[model samples]
Target: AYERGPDPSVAFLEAPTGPHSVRTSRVSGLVSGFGGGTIHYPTGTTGTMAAIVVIPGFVSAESSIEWWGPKLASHGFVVMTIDTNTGFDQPPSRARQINNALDYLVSQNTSRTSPVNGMIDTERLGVIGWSMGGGGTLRVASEGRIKAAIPLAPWDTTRFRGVQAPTLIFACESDLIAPVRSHASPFYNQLPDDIDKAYVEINNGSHYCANGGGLNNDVLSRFGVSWMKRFLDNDTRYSQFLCGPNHESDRNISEYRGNCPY
Candidate 1:
């Protein structure tokens, strides 16, 4: 088990922040193939941690999803929230940027001059994004390299026939921008039943629901961190949070769907 913290309580995971101190460094946008952003990681020597790439939606800047950085890093992972090459970049383009971001993190693992050198485990990785960026998440998920994924209010016109990574989708029940009927629901249905997966529909949530900028973000962090840990870090201690059937018991969730005991 690659577990890095104390045993969790809903309070622990849902706290405003996690247990470790965190730090952030900026990546240059001039970098090739992708618009660089910020890398957030836990400070001190906690051994190597898995890295995750997070992207903003179409026409959105990194600021829209920047909150994920410290939230995830403090919980023990190197988290990079990136800007797409262009705000209008579609899913596939964003997908390419996501891959490039991951490549940069891997390189940092061996770059002696890099602050995160030896602090990242290139073999284990994760992806997260909002809306169109969420679509990009599915694109990379199909490539079978990332260990985990969280697509927030995702919107993709096409189905991913080859996705293999464990995924947790955040669907905004009332979103007109990328309605659940045409996007998130169908995307979840397309996932292979044998793989670890979950769908969480927010009650009357708008498209902005899971982007990590909304209030009550702790709800998202609770599941988000659990899914990332359970799969990306091979940390089974977090399993209890995702495998259960009562997620909908929370008034904020409209539905909780998945194949559990994974």
Candidate 2:
């Protein structure tokens, strides 16, 4: 396994932060494929780490999802939180940006002046997105390159029958913007069974429930970290945190579904 963090525990993962002290850098808007954004990564790491890109939804800015930057980076991966070229861009456009962000991150690995140079495991890429960006997460997953994906309160119409990466979809119980009945639930249903998958509906949550600086960060971050660790890092140590009946009776969760023992 490519485990990069300390041994896991509910208390540790549930915390808003992690053991690794993190650092940040900027990506200029001049860069192609994405609007400028921030990169958050752990300091004092020895090996190359998996890289992840986070995308925001329609009419949203990077602040909408920047909460994921340090949280995921502190746990182990290199995380980039970005804005779309335009907030009005749809899932298809967001999907292209997701891939473009991957390209940018990987390019940095070989750039002599880049802070993240030689720090990325390009082959172990992953993604997380909110709303339409979440839909883009599915589109990118269908392309079959990512190791893991977490789409929060996603809204999309992608055919999504070819996704091979392990995936998790978040549904906000009270969401009317992209209701679970028409969006998150069906997206999960379309995911391939051969790959590990899960659906989690946040109790009393809204369409914005999964975004950065939101009220449900504690519960969502715990699962988000575990899923990334288990799949991107291929760390079975994190498996115990995600595979059991833990969320089944949790107060923060309205419903849970998964083909566990992954």
Candidate 3:
């Protein structure tokens, strides 16, 4: 039924405010999961820009994704946060779910999906994943479905060698599940300097940082919304926030070591 919604429009508010239009929906599909929930779109004189497909971490649900959906929508992206797993939280199942979603998007754009009814452009598509989903993101990015990608605290790095898209990986310096020094750094080096990628080791942050439960902890709460905005919408201003000097500390990073030749 979401496909039946009215044409997209921008909703603007006063100063310290901005354009934002939101709609929520839930649909059932081959993945045995519900699809739908507040998708925000930023308004402007122009029209809809691009869309982002977000996959959350393993054992994590749609509610855990740090409000990344609304943030991307507020910044002019048609964002979709996917629940890639069934009630069971198996890793391979999660990857299959992503494959299904990606396949569906490819089909919808080629057929009768509303906003994408011949207007869909895959060039601007991007992917974001956290934890287990972060691992999935790496897999999807390597598949070359979008132009850019961001994996937050990715779990496994064994297959991270050939990501062609510009990527930014958030390596929680303190995460033992996916230790920055152990997992993310070596993964970064696996890719050549020619690839646009950066690995930022966030200090004082743990594997649980991606969830809102990390609030009051200072570190986790700080990086949530901002990280989504910059990487998803391609906002370069926040570039420094993640890749700039000591900015990781704002999100609380003790030190960041990377091969950023930009």
lDDT scores for all predictions? 0.90, 0.89, 0.56
TM-score, per-candidate, Cα-based:
0.97, 0.97, 0.72
lDDT of 2 by residue, 138-218 (tens): 999888789999999999876577778999998999999999999999888888779899999999888999885677877
Clashing residue pairs in candidate 3, if any? 10-43, 25-36, 25-37, 27-35, 203-253, 249-252, 249-253
Per-residue lDDT tens digits for candidate 1, residues 1-262, read 5788888888899887889888889999998888889999987655888999999998999998988899999999999999988999999999999999999988999987788988888899999999999999999999979999999999988896578999899999999999999999999999976678999999999999998858648679889999998998888888888876498998889898988888
Model 1 lDDT, full chain set? 0.90
lDDT tens per residue, model 3, 125-221: 7767787777777777777667666777777636677777777777776787877767667766776555566665666668765443444233332
Model 2, CA-based lDDT? 0.89
Q: Give the TM-score comparing model 1 with the true structure, all chains together.
A: 0.97
Over 4 Å off in model 3, which ranges? Answer: 1-19, 29-39, 43-45, 87-93, 106-120, 212-251
